[PDB]
Design a protein around this ligand. Sequence first.
Ligand SMILES: [K+]
Ligand SMILES: [K+]
Ligand SMILES: [K+]
Ligand SMILES: [K+]
Length: 683
Amino acid sequence: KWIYKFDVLYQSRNPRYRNYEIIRTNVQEVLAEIVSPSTKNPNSENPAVKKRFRGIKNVVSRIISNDKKCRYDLIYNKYLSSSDTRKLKTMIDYSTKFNRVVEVVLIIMGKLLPLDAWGGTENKKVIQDRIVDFLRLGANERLHLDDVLSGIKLSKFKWLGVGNNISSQQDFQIRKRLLEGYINWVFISLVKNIVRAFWYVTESSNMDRSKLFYFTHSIWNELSSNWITKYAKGNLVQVVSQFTNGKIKLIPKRGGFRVICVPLKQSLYSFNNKRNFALKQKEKWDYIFYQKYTLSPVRQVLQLKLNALRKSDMGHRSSVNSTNEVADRILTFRNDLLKKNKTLPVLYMIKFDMKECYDRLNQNALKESIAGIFKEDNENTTYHVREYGTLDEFLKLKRVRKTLSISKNKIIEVCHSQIEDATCLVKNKEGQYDLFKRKQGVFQGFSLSGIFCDILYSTMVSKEFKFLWEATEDNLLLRLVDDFIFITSNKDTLKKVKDKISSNELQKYGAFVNHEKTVEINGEAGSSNKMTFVGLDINCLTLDVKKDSSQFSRPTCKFRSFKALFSNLKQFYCSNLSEFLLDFSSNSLETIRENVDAILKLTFEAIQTSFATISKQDSFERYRFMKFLHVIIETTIEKFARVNGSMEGVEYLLTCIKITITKSLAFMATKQEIIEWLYTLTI
RNA sequence: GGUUUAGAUCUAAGGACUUCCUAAUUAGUGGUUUGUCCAAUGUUCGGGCAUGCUAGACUCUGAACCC
Ligand SMILES: [K+]
Ligand SMILES: [K+]
Ligand SMILES: [K+]
Ligand SMILES: [K+]
């Protein structure tokens, strides 16, 4: 939990490698960072460590001198500036190859540190093996400093000593303390600075978030500018000079970019003039208060009533919350028609989706939409919601195993302020960011923008697809918000719904149908039967479903007994339990339950396979599998709450895990004791 | 029969706290007393892992592997 990778991410800059040097500090400045990282003025330290100040001062000046004479210009051109105007297929093909970036990182590192600074040649390869490890680190993935030091022989650092071998115990304690400071300074101050100097590293919005992509600044600045000037024409406005400001962040896609705008806490000018650590502290703590007590309550009340709008109102019934609820509804529709027919008629189906649903959202229709769910109520009314708090605010007892209110007369005010005043900061060619508001839509990344689309399209479905609920036993649709699917039994109702999507009537709400991905399938015995909806392989005749079988790979179980099996699953359960998946703002609360079970299920059916293999050799103990479950369950609910910061539905998620594992233990009859233990989990 | 090795103790050498004296500032050097300290420190549900463990002794207790 010492070396984090997010420090390197998203650091864009236009470099000039003619006069360039990575170390920005001096020999006396790095010295304090090595001997006493907590506080400066190493003269306060003990007299025995000053005895070795000369050696620590000597080696740093040598790598600095090498840094000053390091011809970065020749390195860039030789290894990572062979680009050509090829117009490659997909954005991630422009990235520097991972073998190349580690090569450039190491050869710069190699010419920076002499083997004295590496601690011999046998330690140099060890440190290099951890430098490539840090490069393989995912976006959120961290690295423990003790792991980095495992294998590095301290005795070989004679410049870290007085010049002789380790004499006493006290000499060992301080030499190790000095080694930690140095090695940590190597990665934080040099390694992270090396990658930051040459590559804009991004998060590769497609799957396997542990993969980071290294884009050369020259390449990236050309790629983003081209894409952002096309986006600016339709979506952005140059505006004149907080809580409605964010920094734009376009992440790669299949030949495109997904424009995310991560909100910014600092004010309009406290971001520019960052040289005051008195104002930014007073403003970054305004944002945390703005969310918990003013921005979270408005979001909580919106959803809490849309759940009653989705059930009661027929129009919002077509709106879905999770990917699995679409499968159930068609399977209930499958069984609903078999009440009287019992021989399913020829079915007709269509699928379509909206282009840039967030970026095209009609702001004027949005304000009317939110007013629609408050139209029935009064205006000077106050809704109530419960407080959740952070996982740090659970200090009743460590090692985990009330109300709040806001007036709806103000919640409608803060909604409009997020639709109107939302403005991003794109970096100009000069290098200084500019302010841009939105012509249409709302930024992807703003908290309220999530539910803003969910409520609009639910209103949209209600106000437009009124024909399709007359004799709903024949046909019914599901939203799954950015997609759409419709199932019918007669051509009469299919011809009427196809007209509306192919007409401009739907783009009043700001929803433009993507006709390029609009598929039609009929069970006419020769047209088609197989079709794939979002995560559902829906058959036009039997309505069977198997979702991917693919999205999370096999654990490739080979391990022996007893607890070597468990260890591999633990480390490769949290790795598949990325905090991007558990994001409450990005995905739905119900959708998190689905994917957390898929990660859960694959690591329990692989247990049963290799359970009987080593069952003859070793009989498992019914109390070593308990603490395994306790750790797996605890680390899941702790990861889910700490990523969001709130604890919305932590009990909800709790009695989904202990449910999906009580059914994954049907084998091994008389497993009662461990199953009964799963029930008591409440704290 | 062969290989490897531990702790205790003794002696010598060095190291670490603490007062006094160093033409030291990309500097931190060298003598020193009136008490102490020289083996672990991290890490992992008392065993492993990583780093560290001066030099001798026919002083004492031993240990592990192969034939
Ligand atoms: K020493
Ligand atoms: K011996
Ligand atoms: K010995
Ligand atoms: K000994």
